[PDB]
Amino acid sequence: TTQPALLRLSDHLLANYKKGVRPVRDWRKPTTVSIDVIMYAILNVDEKNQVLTTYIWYRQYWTDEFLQWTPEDFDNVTKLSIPTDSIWVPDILINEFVDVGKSPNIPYVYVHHRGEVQNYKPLQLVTACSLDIYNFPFDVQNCSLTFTSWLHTIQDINITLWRSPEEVRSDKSIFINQGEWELLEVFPQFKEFSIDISNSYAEMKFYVIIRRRPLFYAVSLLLPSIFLMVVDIVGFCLPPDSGERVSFKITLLLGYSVFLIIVSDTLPATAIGTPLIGVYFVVCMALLVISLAETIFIVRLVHKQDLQRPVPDWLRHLVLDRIAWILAVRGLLQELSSIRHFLEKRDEMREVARDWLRVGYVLDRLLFRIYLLAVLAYSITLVTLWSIWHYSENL
Amino acid sequence: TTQPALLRLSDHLLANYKKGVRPVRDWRKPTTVSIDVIMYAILNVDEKNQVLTTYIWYRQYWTDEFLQWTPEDFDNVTKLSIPTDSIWVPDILINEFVDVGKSPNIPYVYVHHRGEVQNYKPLQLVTACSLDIYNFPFDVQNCSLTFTSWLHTIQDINITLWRSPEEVRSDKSIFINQGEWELLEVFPQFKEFSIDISNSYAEMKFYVIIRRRPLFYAVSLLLPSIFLMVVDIVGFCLPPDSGERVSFKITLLLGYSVFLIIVSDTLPATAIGTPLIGVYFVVCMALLVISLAETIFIVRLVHKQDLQRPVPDWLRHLVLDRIAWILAVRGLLQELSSIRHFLEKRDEMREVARDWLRVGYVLDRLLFRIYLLAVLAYSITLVTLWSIWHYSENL
Amino acid sequence: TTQPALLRLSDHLLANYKKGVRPVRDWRKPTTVSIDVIMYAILNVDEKNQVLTTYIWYRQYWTDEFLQWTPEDFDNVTKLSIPTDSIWVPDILINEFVDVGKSPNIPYVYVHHRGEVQNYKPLQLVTACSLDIYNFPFDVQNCSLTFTSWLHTIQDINITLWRSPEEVRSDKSIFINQGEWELLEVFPQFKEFSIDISNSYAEMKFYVIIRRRPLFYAVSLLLPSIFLMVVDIVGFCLPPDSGERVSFKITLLLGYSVFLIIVSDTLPATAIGTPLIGVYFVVCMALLVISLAETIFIVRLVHKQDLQRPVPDWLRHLVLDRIAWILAVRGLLQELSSIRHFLEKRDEMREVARDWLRVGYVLDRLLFRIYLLAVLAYSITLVTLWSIWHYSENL
Amino acid sequence: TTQPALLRLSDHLLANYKKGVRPVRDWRKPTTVSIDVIMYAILNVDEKNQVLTTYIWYRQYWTDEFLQWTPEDFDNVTKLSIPTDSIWVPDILINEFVDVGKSPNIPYVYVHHRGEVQNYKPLQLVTACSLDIYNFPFDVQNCSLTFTSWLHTIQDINITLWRSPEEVRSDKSIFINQGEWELLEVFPQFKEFSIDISNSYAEMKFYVIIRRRPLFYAVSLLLPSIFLMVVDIVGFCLPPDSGERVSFKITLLLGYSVFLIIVSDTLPATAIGTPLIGVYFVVCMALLVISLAETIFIVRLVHKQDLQRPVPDWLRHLVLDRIAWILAVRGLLQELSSIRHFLEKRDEMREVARDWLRVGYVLDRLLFRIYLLAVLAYSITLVTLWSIWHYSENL
Amino acid sequence: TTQPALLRLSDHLLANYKKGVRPVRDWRKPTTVSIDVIMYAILNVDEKNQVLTTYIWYRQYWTDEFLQWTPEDFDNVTKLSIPTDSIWVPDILINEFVDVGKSPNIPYVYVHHRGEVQNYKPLQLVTACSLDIYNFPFDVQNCSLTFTSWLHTIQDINITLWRSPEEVRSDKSIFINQGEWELLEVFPQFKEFSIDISNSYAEMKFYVIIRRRPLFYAVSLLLPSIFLMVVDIVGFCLPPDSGERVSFKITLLLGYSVFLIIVSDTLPATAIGTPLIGVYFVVCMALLVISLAETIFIVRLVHKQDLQRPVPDWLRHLVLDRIAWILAVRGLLQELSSIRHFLEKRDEMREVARDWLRVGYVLDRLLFRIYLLAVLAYSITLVTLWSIWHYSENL
Numbered sequence A, B, C, D, E: 001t002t003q004p005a006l007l008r009l010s011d012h013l014l015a016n017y018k019k020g021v022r023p024v025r026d027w028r029k030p031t032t033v034s035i036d037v038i039m040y041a042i043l044n045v046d047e048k049n050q051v052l053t054t055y056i057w058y059r060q061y062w063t064d065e066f067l068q069w070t071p072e073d074f075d076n077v078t079k080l081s082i083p084t085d086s087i088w089v090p091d092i093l094i095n096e097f098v099d100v101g102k103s104p105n106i107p108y109v110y111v112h113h114r115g116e117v118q119n120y121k122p123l124q125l126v127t128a129c130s131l132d133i134y135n136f137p138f139d140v141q142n143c144s145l146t147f148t149s150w151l152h153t154i155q156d157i158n159i160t161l162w163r164s165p166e167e168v169r170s171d172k173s174i175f176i177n178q179g180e181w182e183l184l185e186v187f188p189q190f191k192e193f194s195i196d197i198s199n200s201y202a203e204m205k206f207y208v209i210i211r212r213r214p215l216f217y218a219v220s221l222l223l224p225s226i227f228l229m230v231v232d233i234v235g236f237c238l239p240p241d242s243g244e245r246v247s248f249k250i251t252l253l254l255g256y257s258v259f260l261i262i263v264s265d266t267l268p269a270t271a272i273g274t275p276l277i278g279v280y281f282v283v284c285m286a287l288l289v290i291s292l293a294e295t296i297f298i299v300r301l302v303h304k305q306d307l308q309r310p311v312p313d314w315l316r317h318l319v320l321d322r323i324a325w326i327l328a329v330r331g332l333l334q335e336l337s338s339i340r341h342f343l344e345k346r347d348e349m350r351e352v353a354r355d356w357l358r359v360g361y362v363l364d365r366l367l368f369r370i371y372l373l374a375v376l377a378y379s380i381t382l383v384t385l386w387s388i389w390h391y392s393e394n395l
């Protein structure tokens, strides 16, 4: 009577109570813990080592059947807070743990009448996910979390949800914005696990769908690459100025290399595969340097005064292409004759060499048409990728 | 009597006292903890992962109503220090915790008569903030801290301030100088939190305003970029020396690229957006390389002796631009005739080609005027940014 | 009777039981712990410091001979869970530990009748392995783990397997896919260790075979290097255009250098040796720059009008190569004579210099044949490497 | 008697003794702890985040007035070692703590008669200092440490020195050599701290003076920069070979850029200011590129055959500079006349253009004299910096 | 009798035994702990912060004189294992500790009769060593470890070796191969330490000799640098083709710069000094760029038609070098005279300019001989370095 209600209740409950045993009056009936998880934020995502870092708010509740008392004797007190180190605590944790999680400690738990026990805690989960960068700008990731007791079997601990699944699937009330990645949904699913028959352990599967935000990467990658893509408009109806034109084209190639290496060194870290953007980048440059090689080989072969190939080989190339397509006065007089030939040999040879440059000219415009076809294919596959992303958001 | 006062008081108080329960004689009345926070320093700010690291000095006080004694019996002692592990300690912490905070431990607390209990501690807070780099040189950040009990509700623990808010808003007595970022104000605000009706948890909001120092970044970015901006004075009344001038302009472009890549690789780490300085940088270079492309296309098209376009297309371009603007002796005689034409063909063709370079010249000065307009817009938007920063300091 | 079975059994067992001693009723008989390890994933592999990070699921079982009771008295309960801090736990650990392993804690253990005690735990092993990068694209690694008691001898603790070794050798039921490295087999072997006679300590050897996946590295290294390998097709029947050809070849060398340095700076981290790919890369470039040096030396030596070496040295080089192979009218008349020689000296000297370029031409095609032989050797050694890898998978 | 002296003394002292209270028989008299710190090494200094890492050996002593006994009864034992967890330990620590310090634990303390208690410990201090890089090669830093009790006031704990300050100021007996930074002095000073009147807390200020070693940085920076500074000797009496000279000067500029960027990327990390060496580096390059711009503008303006500016503007520039300084036979005859002018127009125009290059030449030598003046100023300010450093060592 | 021997012995020994005091029956006699250390591996060595990371196996033994019993009463049991937290443990540790060492815990210790107590533990030591990179490829390091009690004096704890020193000096039975660094010897030495007279603390010095493996660094540094060293064979009997030769030499310089910067950025991290290889690298490049400067200055000074220096200065340079060495028909006739001079002025001036290039040629071959002398000095100092390394292995 003189003692306060809280101290009397704590003395009546915590006394002569052994921790470390399952609080069930009959050993056959298993205890059922129920859990609930709320998304807070995605701290960091990296694809060099397949590591996902997230932050969850976790709450669990179960029945501690030893902790019962009559509220009518204890001055109407239907609430109690006790240290978490003095009662039973189940070992429910995630199946994979690349680290400890460096979780803070909350050393208080709730105790209602009729044995209800609740526990709240924040958790920082660092795990491993099967990340893929098949579609880099428009990426969706399906990660998994597995809540399971590491030692107890299905005859001891079973897992259940606090709320209906439909409410869990839509949870954005706590997720903070201004982040690189955003939550789409969380899906719970009850599975049964077993590796070796004798024992069957319970399981709780949480599927998380995460979608990237293609704004900063899109702006920093697609816009400036397309803008510096100027060989398309330069190579249209190319003149025979290749000699100095490809000198500047090789300068431009050096600039492109710089642009390719800074981007490669900073953004991609996929160690198992390649995005489609990278391989199409690669093949576009492949046939650009090939166009360079053809347009330098032509001018180098016609450069000299040997008129390219005077042997019957150009006609063969043409026909195969078509098939696959389907005294003193005497001295002064002799003086006159020697002058003319020298005065007109130079410009004649120069103009004959220059006139062979239509043979020079051919076939580069054709592979330019092939380049335009490749550009159109790249644009249409980007459009289809955006369409795939739009379907990906259909949830 | 023979025993000293301190040991007698400690024996009288710490004995038969159960920790882990709320020290209230009636369970209905909630206990009220009050807090106080002082800024020390901003350790590190990075925008790659939205992480803020700060250092605070924290003090809290409340009423431990079990710890009461009469000073007239205990030889006039109105002060007491006891270990912090032997009494009740509330679980007031910040809502977000990207890490533990790696806080040191101070295992002593104050105990006055009439149940007053005070606690001092230093805290190293590492949190997540909605950082934005919309205005890079002149940046202001509004971060938030949320002191809240992780388990107890509003019927158990309520939060209050030790001092008046106006004193808290101006606190620079401890903040150390010589740092990259500086404190502006700290604002407390009492909110009520609830996610699900049944329970309502208290809350304590601390809004921190942090302003950057634009000295080293300004000196290292705006001054040398403006100084190496010399194409403005080079491109004024450009002569027809473009052939070798744009060879050196492409060299200058390579140098600019180097300057752009070292800066890009080191300073910016925004993964969600772009500052205005970056995009204006981008568009200025965009139309600089466009000026390069036009001034090389012109000289390459007039380079050869085909007099550019002898077809009626230049007149069309001009009119569309205007609309949008709104025996022996006989042999010696025949010898004379052949000489002259050859002796005067070369210089004539050269001078006719050179004379077509006014048509060559046009329209680059016009896009140079467009460049000057862009430069003026950049300067005026920098001025307006500085004005926005001056308003931002108005607090 | 009134008390539940679990509490009565825990009180009967845990009471008056001293931990920290070996639970054997006769001290002569040693206790035998048995272990079992399952692969989960390979977290990270790096060759800069010879560090291997893995994840294992570990279970051990032994006989705690003090913990015995009759199930017929205790209401048929053949299962028990007790805290792991209240009984004896052997100190079985790995011999090498570059770090602690940052393992989570599972504070519950199983206790059956007749003294059976089982323990489950996850372990994150970070160790040191004798990694070799002799064969980089097609690599196989043989790491070792050594389970051993750090203090107890063979007269106290002996190690045994739970299951037959043949089942342990094939374990892929838990290993997660989508990783850089994949498991091949785990092999257990019982060894006896001793450094100094007096004492003999037991040991448990686990040999792990890990095979790399050559997809992303192969695509990013062999395909683009082979594609940019174009000097092979350029250098075939090289013309005497070397003057500007090697100017572009040196440009290409600069590009190759860039390609070599980004790759070197990012992928290889071997600090003790070299892969065969690197050294063959090195020697191929060696003789490419040597071809460059020869083809510039030739054109520089024949460049001037000194006709290369008019001294009898070229014949010596040829023979050593073959051996190792096994008044007024008079004034006008005098005017005529002076003109001709000047009008025909220039082109004559030019054509004589040009005609000496067959001597110029020789021997570069021969070292080109040597280059082709080196390329063939590189291809055939790559084929043999793939064949070695195919044998390596034979397990 | 039969029991040994040590066990009897430990039983007599440690028994019935309450820890967690101040060991003073009268509560009014404060206890006085005294400290002593010895420098060991400076582990790491970085200016990106203002972090100082040091290593100290710390010893403290005070009077535990409860721990007294008569040595004449306890078999002459004037020395005792007891665990540090069983008695009172003051909470004296440093005011700033960017981390915990990761200090090892020494769980033994000394206990003499008459209550003397001593404690030895090593500490690894990581703190924040107001680092400045105003004078980079010749730098001196003044860091501060503040030993203070985090909770107790001046009426409870006071701080004193073990030894005289003069001995503390000279302490190099433990400092290890072969380090980047070296100790100069440690200065103790007793301050009184208070933020809010009611309470006054004690304080112990340790000022540390640290001086850098300018050997490796000096060798790697000043010697090679001065050596590659060759434009000074090249630009002396510059000839009119600017056309190809500034082509190589721009090549040299590229090399200088490389030298500037590797150094910038590796050594400086000041985020708040600039050293004088950097700004003088910047201004020297500023007017070097300005000399480049002037010497290219001149040759480009005189390049063409328009004789630079034939308009009366060069005279204006000169005067402003001075002010600021303070049938058949007829056909053959007509044939002769046409030849001469063509045969002598070319070389005449060439020589007239070449002769205008004295006007070309002027004023670059004058700005070269300005460059020499800047070089002399740089040398003299380096000399004055060395003199400042020599005064800085005066201690 | 009914109770087992182990439990009876543990109850008889661990009961009524106070830990935290020195187990000596007379306080005057000091206790003597003996230690033994075995090398396992060298985890990481870096010279940016003078940090050494090693792994040791440590065992200590001493006499716990309270723990004695008669084996004839306790059923012949001469072996015992007890937890390490229940008895006295000396605080023997290393003097320097840049970190904690993150050592695992082995909570069991051996106890024989007659008070013998042994303890085994693995230790991961991270320390500070006076590393020097004076001789980079052929380096030997002499590190020190100091086992000492941090609180107890020579009157309480003395250090001794378990085995003879000669056996300790040769210990390679546990060291793992395939590492960057290898063990040479470990040398123990007994020192006496004192800083301040009153007290004298014991000490145990372990000198470790570590020798690098010069295979990967040698292959990656000396072979390719020597191979790309081709200016030696190019500069031999240099022709007057310098104009384009030094254009390619400056290209080669750019390539050398790239080679120098990647290597500098990756391998060296010495912050206090320089290796001899670096400074000889520096001086070789110094006089290579000086050769470049001389050979460009010569050709630029003779480039124009001013015949270099027609002033009497070349003779002065030569002599100082030698000293330091120790009507109509009239019109047609006038027409003839004007032709000849123009027809023969050009080639005459060209050949006179070309003929002045022997004066052009001199002195570069002489500084080439100086280069060859420098190369020979570099080779001979490398040979002497290898000889020093061979003596260094003499142990």
Ligand SMILES: O=C1c2cccc3[nH]nc(c23)CCN1[C@@H]1CN2CCC1CC2
Pocket (backbone or CB within 6 Å): A036, A037, A038, A057, A058, A059, A120, B095, B148, B149, B150, B151, B193, B195, B196, B201
């Ligand atoms: O995490 C949850 C939480 C978890 C799981 C289910 C939940 N429903 N409603 C909530 C909640 C809200 C309660 N908190 C937090 C924990 N304390 C501090 C912050 C919130 C308020 C009480």
Ligand SMILES: O=C1c2cccc3[nH]nc(c23)CCN1[C@@H]1CN2CCC1CC2
Pocket (backbone or CB within 6 Å): C095, C148, C149, C150, C151, C193, C195, C196, C201, E036, E037, E038, E057, E058, E059, E120
């Ligand atoms: O470290 C030592 C060791 C230390 C110091 C001296 C030593 N002599 N002989 C040895 C040893 C061998 C014993 N182990 C190890 C510790 N346990 C696990 C591995 C070894 C066997 C027992």
Ligand SMILES: O=C1c2cccc3[nH]nc(c23)CCN1[C@@H]1CN2CCC1CC2
Pocket (backbone or CB within 6 Å): D036, D037, D038, D057, D058, D059, D120, E095, E148, E149, E150, E151, E193, E195, E196, E201
């Ligand atoms: O740190 C100090 C020390 C501190 C403060 C004052 C000091 N005076 N003399 C010393 C010392 C020397 C004592 N040690 C060390 C601590 N143990 C291991 C190494 C030394 C010897 C005893």
